[PDB]
Amino acid sequence: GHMGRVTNQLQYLHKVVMKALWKHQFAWPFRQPVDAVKLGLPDYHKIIKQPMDMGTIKRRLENNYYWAASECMQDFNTMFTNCYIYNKPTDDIVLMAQTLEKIFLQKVASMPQEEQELVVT
Ligand SMILES: Cc1noc(C)c1-c1cc(C(N)=O)c2c(c1)c1ccc(C(=O)N3C[C@@H](C)O[C@@H](C)C3)cc1n2CC1CC1
Numbered sequence: 001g002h003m004g005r006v007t008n009q010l011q012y013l014h015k016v017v018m019k020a021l022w023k024h025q026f027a028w029p030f031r032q033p034v035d036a037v038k039l040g041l042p043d044y045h046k047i048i049k050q051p052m053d054m055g056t057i058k059r060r061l062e063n064n065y066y067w068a069a070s071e072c073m074q075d076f077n078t079m080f081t082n083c084y085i086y087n088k089p090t091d092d093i094v095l096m097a098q099t100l101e102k103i104f105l106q107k108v109a110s111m112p113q114e115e116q117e118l119v120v121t
Helices: 008-022 054-062 069-086 092-109
Strands: none
Touching: 008 054, 008 069, 008 092, 054 069, 069 092
């Protein structure tokens, strides 16, 4: 019971935002879902109810899964927040998320302000 589309903001999130974040030095733990068995975190899925990662976001952008840019921005917010709330403040993963979230926020500030659907053939 869901469908997506191509908007100017969603295209910006794919072509500008995801391009800057995907290739970053600190992106590698965020490129695929948190593997709690590999990491030895048996409480992860008890605490985190909505896991999210950049690989899922990228795939969703490529397959036009989102109806609006706000849904994609929520996925980014969830991914960063999951990381901060679950982990210890002294874990380096926290600083890696902080570095990427700062880039994310700056790019969102430069996004075209009004959401419009595009005709993409
Ligand atoms: C994100 C995130 N939020 O909370 C946590 C915890 C995470 C989060 C998520 C993942 C994941 N996606 O499963 C994850 C890590 C942290 C993580 C930390 C360290 C190492 C590690 O020790 N390495 C790998 C490095 C390439 O080389 C070293 C030599 C050894 C692997 C890790 N992975 C595995 C991923 C590479 C596939």
